[PDB]
């Protein structure tokens, strides 16, 4: 049993679905991310709101992978004016600080079968780009994300 999120009280977390892996290798060597103009502020919404009370998660999945490819927390408001050119979409301007926590795949068939009541009862392997997860249905997804082998 990996019980370390069984009982968090607090946080945020989010499905992060990409149509690049290479932006994905950049984001865990550098520890950056940058979403859409619309995916940047409800994240940072989101962040600026907790104001350090407790984390915002991220769960990566690349779009046609069949997995989920790692988590991490969310470390910094958006910058919206920064280097452009830097991510598979070029006109893509933002950024803002990640720490990677786990770095592995995990099979959609491990996490089919928990369903977002706050999107219609989908599985949590059919959402979009900055869909939010529940906290008790986010907690079993660390915890099989966690443990997998």
Not at 62 to 77: D, P, R, T, W, Y
Request: hydrophobic share 35%; glycine share 6%; with cysteine.
């Amino acid at each position: 049993e990996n019980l370390y999120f069984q009982h968090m009280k607090h946080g945020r977390v989010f499905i992060i679905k990409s149509y690049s892996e290479d932006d994905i290798h950049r984001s865990i060597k550098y520890n950056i991310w940058c979403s859409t103009e619309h995916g940047n502020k409800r994240l940072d919404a989101a962040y600026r709101s907790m104001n350090g009370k407790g984390p915002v998660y991220l769960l990566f999945s690349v779009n046609g992978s069949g997995h989920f490819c790692g988590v991490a927390e969310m470390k910094s408001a958006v910058d919206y004016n920064t280097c452009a050119g830097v991510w598979s979409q070029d006109k893509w301007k933002g950024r803002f600080d990640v720490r990677w926590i786990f770095v592995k795949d995990v099979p959609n068939s491990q996490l089919r079968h928990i369903r977002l009541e706050n999107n219609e009862n989908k599985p949590v392997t059919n959402s979009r780009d900055t869909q939010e997860v529940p906290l008790e249905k986010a907690k079993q997804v660390l915890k099989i994300i966690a443990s997998y082998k």
